[PDB]
Amino acid sequence: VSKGEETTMGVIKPDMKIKLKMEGNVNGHAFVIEGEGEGKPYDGTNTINLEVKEGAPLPFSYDILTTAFNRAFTKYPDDIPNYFKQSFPEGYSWERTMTFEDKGIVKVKSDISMEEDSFIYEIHLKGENFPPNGPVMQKKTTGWDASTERMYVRDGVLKGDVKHKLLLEGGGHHRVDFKTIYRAKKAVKLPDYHFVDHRIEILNHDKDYNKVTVYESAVARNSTD
Amino acid sequence: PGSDLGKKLLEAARAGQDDEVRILMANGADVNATDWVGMTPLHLAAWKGHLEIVEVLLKTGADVNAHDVFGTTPLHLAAHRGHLEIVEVLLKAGADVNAQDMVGKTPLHLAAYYGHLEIVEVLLKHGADVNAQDKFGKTPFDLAIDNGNEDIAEVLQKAAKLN
């Protein structure tokens, strides 16, 4: 364990559980999902098991939800200040807009807190203007490509941008731009410009995606690296 | 429309910097400045529990019934957090006691879920609908039961009796 990682070992353990609830409304359809999982914050991995509690079956691609289901689960080198791990135990919140190539839009916010050895998320997600015959409402997506999020400070908080690609049945893709604001609930040491490389996948699901397992890996690095 | 003073006012309300809020308003800040998820200074002051700032924002023209992109009003936020005096001030200023958010929840749903009995009683007194169903068919009573708020559940069950 490195010097920088040890500074938060008192609060964020090498294994942490996850509990979450999402209230959502996509093209007018309301739903609730609850999740439980676990991850390794210093390895940058996390796994969440999700269940649709209200509004089943979902009439849209589950992929527009998966990146809403916590950058505390990011491997960070010691020379890049770790905005997310520093924020705990108090935690942080984030706000995000995802703009889709066919003018669908998702707006989502999340509150990330900590209780004992668990992170707790409260998520609200709204999707609007998805064309009914587009790949989101027709459930013709396969998953997200690997991505690189650009992290940089503005207005005393951390911003993250992703030029993303939603992969489609048949081999095509759908451009999606992510913009996120991450707000620590206390003063932390702020990082310079850097990257976070992501890979998110659905490992398992039942036919209607009422039950889904999501996995994500995330690693921070400098642009030179 | 977005403005530089508006952005600073949103941040001052978000940060609970009451004196800075007053300075910004004095210099023309738009009291109804709105961020990219629909939050206004009144939303933020209501959530943070800063009663004096809620009052001056309402006095200088803040929209008491503004909703964010998830359908949440300042009254929702104050009922959620248990801010009794702010709930009273918002209602006095015209807040819609039965406003529903994007999943159909009213302020009474939230007060019941989060266990704020005094707020439950204030909302009821001003005509909150005890039988209101969210988009999943659930009433405030259901949410009080779900979260083990038994005293609130009794208040709501008694109030649901019709004649």
Author numbering:
A (entry chain A): -7 to 61, 65 to 220
B (entry chain B): 2 to 164
The authors write:
Here, we report the selection of designed ankyrin repeat proteins (DARPins) recognizing mTFP1 (monomeric teal fluorescent protein 1). We characterized these binders both biochemically and biophysically and determined the three-dimensional structure of one DARPin-mTFP1 complex. The two DARPins we report here bind specifically and with high affinity to mTFP1.
In order to understand the basis for specificity and structural changes in the binding of the selected DARPins to mTFP1, the crystal structures of the mTFP1/DARPin 1238_E11 complex were determined. The mTFP1/DARPin 1238_E11 complex was obtained by mixing mTFP1 with a 1.2-fold excess of DARPin 1238_E11 and subjecting the mixture to gel filtration. We determined the crystal structure of the mTFP1/-DARPin 1238_E11 complex in two space groups, to 1.6 Å (P6522) and 1.85 Å (C2) resolution, respectively. DARPin 1238_E11 binds into a cavity along mTFP1 including β-strands 1, 4, 5 and 6, comprising a protein-protein binding surface of 790 Å2 and thus similar in size compared to other known DARPin protein complexes. Residues from the N-Cap and the three DARPin repeats make specific contacts with mTFP1.
